Amino acid sequence: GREQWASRLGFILAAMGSAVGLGNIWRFSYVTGENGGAAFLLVYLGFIALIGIPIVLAEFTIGRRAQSDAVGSFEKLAPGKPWKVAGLMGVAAGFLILSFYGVIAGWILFYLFNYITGQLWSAPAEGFGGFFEGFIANPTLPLFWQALFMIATIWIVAIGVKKGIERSNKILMPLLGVLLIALAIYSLTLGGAKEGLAFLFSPDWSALKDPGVYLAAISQAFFTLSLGMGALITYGSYVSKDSRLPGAAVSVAGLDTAFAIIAGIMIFPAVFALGLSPSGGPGLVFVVLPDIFDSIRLGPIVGIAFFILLGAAALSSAVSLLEVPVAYFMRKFDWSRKQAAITLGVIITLLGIPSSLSFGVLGEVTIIPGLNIFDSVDFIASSVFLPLGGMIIALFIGWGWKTSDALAESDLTDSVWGKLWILSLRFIAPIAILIVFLSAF
Ligand SMILES: CCCCCCCCCCCCO[C@H]1O[C@H](CO)[C@@H](O[C@H]2O[C@H](CO)[C@@H](O)[C@H](O)[C@H]2O)[C@H](O)[C@H]1O
Ligand SMILES: CCCCCCCCCO[C@@H]1O[C@H](CO)[C@@H](O)[C@H](O)[C@H]1O
Ligand SMILES: CCCCCCCCCO[C@@H]1O[C@H](CO)[C@@H](O)[C@H](O)[C@H]1O
Ligand SMILES: CCCCCCCCCO[C@@H]1O[C@H](CO)[C@@H](O)[C@H](O)[C@H]1O
Ligand SMILES: CCCCCCCCCO[C@@H]1O[C@H](CO)[C@@H](O)[C@H](O)[C@H]1O
Ligand SMILES: N[C@@H](Cc1c[nH]c2ccccc12)C(=O)O
Ligand code: NA
Ligand code: NA
C-alpha cells in the first residue's frame, strides 16, 4: 500500500522541488559571504561535481531499489548490518534542519505580509537593517509566522505523495528563476558590479588555508542538494522502474547550481553597491533585497513576487524535509500519515522555537562552544550529520554492493561514467569527506 508518483515527471520535479529553496538564496549568500567568495565558491562547485552528483545518484538508487524509507531501505537491503546508522542519523538531521528552516521561512512570510499590506515600500526610519533586527529579536512575532509556515508544510505532507507533494504548481520554480535572472541583471547596473563580481569569481587562495572553509563548502553542498539524510532515498522510493536515475541526478545538481550562481550574481554586486559587509551573517539577504527593491520604482510589486515565489520554493523544500521522519514513523510505528505529519510537525516546530529565540533574548546562550542555539543546530545537522551520512551512503554502495548490482540499479553500465561513479563512491567522495573532517578538527 506504499505510495508511488502518479505522473512521469513527478519524481524529477519533486527532487528538483526538494533541492531548490532557501539554501540557494538565503544560505548560499551568507555562507559564501562569510567565507570570502570565489575560493569558497570553487571548492563548493568542485564538491558538487565530484561528491554531490554521485551521492545524489546513490540516494536515488538505494531508494528506488528498496522502496522504503531512509532507515527501512538499509534494513531491507542489508539486514543486521550497521549501514542503517546513516538513515537513523538522517531522520535526526530532518528534525534538526526543519526546526530552523521553518523559522527562516517564517521570516519570508513576514516579509511577504509587509509588502502586501504596504509596509516595506519605502525605507523604515530605522532602515532596512534596523527593521530586520527588530523583527527577529522580537520574542513572539517570528514564532507566529514560523507556526503558520509549518502548518502549510504539515498539511501537504498529511495529504500524501500523490495528492500533496506531487501536486506543486509547476510554473512557480521556473518563475522564481526568471525573476532571479532579471534581478541579477538589474543589480549588475547598480555600481558595485566590478567589486561584487571580483568577490564572487576571482579567487583569493589565502582563504583556503583555513580548514573551516572546506567544511563550510561541503556542508553547503550537502544542504543545497537536499543530501545525506535520506530525503532523496525517500523520494526515490516512490519511483517506478520507469525512470532514469543518472539523468535526474545530473539535472537536479545542474539546476540547483544555476539557481545558486545567479543568486550570488544578484546579491554581491548589490552588497557592494550598498557599502555593506558580505560577512553579515544569516540576515544578509533580508537586509539587502528590500534595499534593492526600494531603488526600483515598481519595487513593491517585485518584492511581492519575490517573497511569494521564494515562499513556494521554501515550502516544497520543507515538505521533503518533513517527509523523512514521517515516512519512517509511518512504517516503524504504524502511524497514519496524517497522524505522523501533525505529531512530528508540531514537535519540530517547538524544537525550532529556541533557534528563533537565539536571534534575540537567547542570543547569549551557547551549546557547542562559542555557537548560539541556531548556529549549533545547523553545525551539528549540516556540518556533521549530512556529510557523515553521505559518507556512509557512499561506502555502502561502493563497498557493500556487488558492482554489477550498483550499476544495474542505477541505470549505468561499466562504461567510463559508471566507472567514474563507482570510483567516486568507493574512494573520492568518502575520502574527501574524511579529509575535510580530520583537517577541520
Ligand atoms: C503572508 C500570508 C498571510 C498570512 C495570514 C495573515 C494573518 C494576519 C496576521 C498579522 C498579525 C501580526 O501583527 C503584528 O504586526 C506588526 C508587524 O507586522 C507588529 O509590529 C511590530 O513590528 C516590529 C517588527 O520589526 C516589532 O519588533 C515591534 O515590536 C512591533 O511593533 C505587531 O506588534 C504584531 O501584532
Ligand atoms: C528578463 C530580463 C529583465 C531585465 C531587467 C534589467 C533592467 C536594468 C535596469 O537598469 C537601470 O535602468 C536605468 C535606465 O536604463 C539606468 O539609468 C539605471 O542606472 C539602471 O540601474
Ligand atoms: C555576469 C558576469 C560574469 C563575469 C565574472 C568575472 C569577474 C571576475 C574577475 O574580476 C576581475 O578581477 C581583476 C583583478 O581583481 C580586475 O582587474 C578586473 O577589473 C575584475 O573585473
Ligand atoms: C557566469 C560565469 C562567471 C565565472 C568567471 C570565472 C573566471 C574569473 C576569474 O578570473 C580572474 O581574473 C584575474 C585577472 O588577472 C586573475 O587573477 C584570475 O585569472 C582570476 O582571479
Ligand atoms: C521580471 C521583471 C523584474 C524587474 C527587475 C528590474 C527593475 C527595472 C528597473 O527600473 C528602474 O530602475 C532605476 C534604478 O535606479 C530607477 O531609476 C527606476 O525608478 C526603476 O523603475
Ligand atoms: N535543499 C533545500 C533544503 C532541503 C530540503 N530537503 C533537505 C534534506 C537535506 C538537507 C537540506 C534539505 C534548500 O537548499 O533549501
Ligand atoms: Na538548494
Ligand atoms: Na523547494
UniProtKB/TrEMBL annotation:
Sorted alphabetically, the keyword list is: Membrane, Transmembrane, Transmembrane helix, Transport
Task: Give the subcellular location.
Answer: Membrane
Kindly name one Pfam family recorded for this protein: SNF
Cellular component, GO, one term:
membrane
- Keyword Transmembrane assigned: yes
Q: Does the keyword Membrane apply?
A: yes
This chain's protein is named Sodium-dependent transporter
- Specify the species: Halalkalibacterium halodurans (strain ATCC BAA-125 / DSM 18197 / FERM 7344 / JCM 9153 / C-125)
